[PDB]
Amino acid sequence: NPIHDRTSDYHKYLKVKQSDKRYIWYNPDPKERDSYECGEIVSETSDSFTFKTVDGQDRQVKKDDANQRNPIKFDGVEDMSELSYLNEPAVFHNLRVRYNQDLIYTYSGLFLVAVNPFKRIPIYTQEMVDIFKGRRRNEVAPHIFAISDVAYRSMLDDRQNQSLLITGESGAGKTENTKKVIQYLASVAGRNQANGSGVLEQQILQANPILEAFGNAKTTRNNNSSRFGKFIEIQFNSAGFISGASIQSYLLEKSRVVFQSETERNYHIFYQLLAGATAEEKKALHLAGPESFNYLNQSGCVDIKGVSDSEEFKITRQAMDIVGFSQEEQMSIFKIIAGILHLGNIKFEKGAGEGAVLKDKTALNAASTVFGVNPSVLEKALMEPRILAGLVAQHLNVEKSSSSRDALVKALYGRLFLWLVKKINNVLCQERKAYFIGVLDISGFEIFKVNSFEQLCINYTNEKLQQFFNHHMFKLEQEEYLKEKINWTFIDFGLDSQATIDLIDGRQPPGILALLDEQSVFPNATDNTLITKLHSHFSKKNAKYEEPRFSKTEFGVTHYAGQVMYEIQDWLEKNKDPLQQDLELCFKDSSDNVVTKLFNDPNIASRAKKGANFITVAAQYKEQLASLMATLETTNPHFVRCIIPNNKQLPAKLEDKVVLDQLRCNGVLEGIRITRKGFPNRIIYADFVKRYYLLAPNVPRDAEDSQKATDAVLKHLNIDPEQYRFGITKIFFRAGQLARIEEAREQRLESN
Ligand SMILES: Nc1ncnc2c1ncn2[C@@H]1O[C@H](COP(=O)(O)OP(=O)(O)O)[C@@H](O)[C@H]1O
Ligand SMILES: Cc1ccc2c(c1)C(=O)[C@]1(O)CCN(c3ccccc3)C1=N2
């Protein structure tokens, strides 16, 4: 039995190897709430603690705001819910104790938390794989394999699709753990020797460098940030063999193509192409350095420390070779990327009149060449599009025409992104599936210095997914209480998120997105009109809304992860998404095979179209979110949280400020908040008696009636009866009660 043999590798790499004072976690600087020091408690009141700081000073904290340290027996628990003092620095502390012993996987209730070790740990060998084949969560130690295996067994046993919601930015090990999930499924889903899903495993993983190049960018927070969300399906036939894979992509931050904030970058692919292309490629596409393109030079950043964009281009090209893109398709792909940049170098100049003119036509001709369109047709389609009056030319002014040029750049880039996913799906999905195990990968919760419409949609997606988690926790907790016949009554945890979701997207009262859709069609609405309408509806009316005293262009939303303030500039223009038909007819006529598909395929083109009208981005956004949540509610969900230990790519250096910030955003701390309100610590009686038979007189270590023996210990210790409940198999304890009993045990054996 490797699981029970303590000489085994399983116990060496996945299990834990092992004073009287009381300490408390505290913040030396209260403004830095995630940086903690340990302090000794010295005095005690009815309402407070007094503790010594590391420098020897004395401090008072009210007992209701104190983050007590857990007794050492709690150090290394496989589930955070096993901690008695369940608070933020105590949870981080448990993570540190396990990280320094190379235990990178820890449960937090339903969550599997995975911290990137920045070093190879030998826990993914085939012997390891064998350990987890067929095992349930509580039979083995925390491991990504355990989540994969539980999901696989339930898929066949319940004949139900499964979802795996996973969070983590570049550097947290999310890509690695997703690859581990795929390879574990592939290992057990096939025959032990003759499984034949080797090519598909290669193509799924090689799909990632491609969408990373076109969909990831450098933000102020991360060098490789996913500006789109995706759902990856591991598909199975009815017998449980891997049958294929699919990728579903959600809205992309196409506004990033035309605009980047200071010190940020456009999507990687532009810098890869300009840096990695051959001399004959550059001339053919009329390329220059990033400095020479307005779409790449407005930010002051064109390179990433320690990232070679030419080397990255060869990796992306190689990836495209592998997933099936032909040389003709790859060259058309970069013609489009090259064309987009050329489009952005067009300078529309103010003519002597209302309409705009184009003095220099160099950029227009360079774009028409690589796109395969007629420069004159494009020129008029941009500056003099035709509308209807039972077709009427309409001369446009400068920014009216620059904005339509931008709209073409966004539509071109966005449709190209959808086409890449469709092409990758072509080699990944060649069989109708029976079941799927789906990996959800959305842009994580975001707080920039200036947060705009995109951030409200991103954080709203996380807000609804955190509620999805909270409701699932609720039903599993109810199941646990009645199976134990614990008389405790809690309301649905999902409803704590409901105020914030109603504020963003409710129907009556109308939420922010509905008020935005309304203002977008009101003739003379501005952004000032929009935010005023927002304040009128919500300031001092929705409890999660805030009208700031300081600024007149910002509104605040209180998410599960904290408060975020959104600047309202350009929300109406961002919500409106037109493309003039003259532009679309001009590119339907193109001589390039890939470009034509972008405007002729009713799936790539005609995306969220509405009978000769384009719907709003908020409308497009709600459509995708509602369909995702519908798919998700049919599945059995599992949750994985990937964490960056630090920002220095360093092994064995876990930093509280870095880690804690992520656990707030990814929902783990929200789950902690709910767990600590109830009865987290649940002990089988015989175990409680065995540990604490010596705190009460005349209690045998192995009592026949442990229920009675536990009541003896609790009564003798004068434990507050409000702090525990008696189950049929276990005793339920409130936060802190088990720690005090543990302390009492320490002192008594201290004295011995
Ligand atoms: N569990 C792990 N064990 C060892 N190395 C890891 C693990 N997870 C991630 N890494 C390493 O850390 C880096 C970041 O991984 P990851 O975040 O998954 O990739 P990306 O940055 O592309 O998202 C990679 O170079 C990988 O080698
Ligand atoms: C399930 C779902 C549905 C819609 C989504 C997302 C996920 C995202 O994560 C994003 O892909 C992150 C970028 N983004 C976005 C960009 C511009 C405007 C609105 C949303 C997203 N919308």
Numbering used by the authors: 2 to 19, 30 to 401, 404 to 765
Which of the paper's sentences describe this entry?
Despite their specialized cellular functions, all members of the myosin superfamily share a common multistep mechanism of force generation—the chemomechanical actomyosin motor cycle. The myosin motor is thus subject to substantial conformational changes along that cycle, traversing through different actin-attached and –detached states, eventually amplifying them to a large scale rotation of the converter domain and swinging of the adjacent lever arm in the force-generating power stroke. ADP release is key for the regulation of the mechanical motor function of myosin as it controls the fraction of time the motor stays attached to the actin filament.
In a series of crystallization trials using the myosin-II inhibitor blebbistatin, we obtained a previously unknown conformation of myosin in the presence of ADP. We solved the crystal structure of the Dd myosin-II motor domain in complex with blebbistatin and ADP to a resolution of 2.58 Å. The hallmarks of the unique structure are a converter position close to the rigor down position, rearrangements of the active site switches closer together, and a large shift of the P-loop together with the bound ADP towards the protein surface, while the β-phosphate of ADP lost most of its coordination with protein residues. The positions of the active site switches (closed with the P-loop shifted towards the surface), and the converter/lever arm (near down position), as well as the status of the actin-binding cleft (almost closed), the relay helix (straight), and the transducer (almost fully twisted) suggest that the structure resembles a myosin conformation towards the end of the power stroke that promotes ADP release. Blebbistatin was found in the same binding site as observed in the crystal structure of the myosin-II pre-power stroke state, and interacts with residues of the relay and W-helices, as well as active site switches in close proximity to β-strands 5 to 7 of the transducer. Consistently, the converter is rotated by approximately 55° as compared to the up position in the pre-power stroke state, and would need to undergo only a minor 4° to 5° converter rotation to transition to the down position in the rigor state. Similarly, a transition by approximately 1 Å of both the inner and outer actin-binding cleft (myosin-II·ADP·blebbistatin complex: inner cleft: 11.7 Å and outer cleft: 11.3 Å) separates the blebbistatin-bound myosin-II·ADP from the fully closed actin-binding cleft as seen in the apo rigor state, indicating a new actin interface.
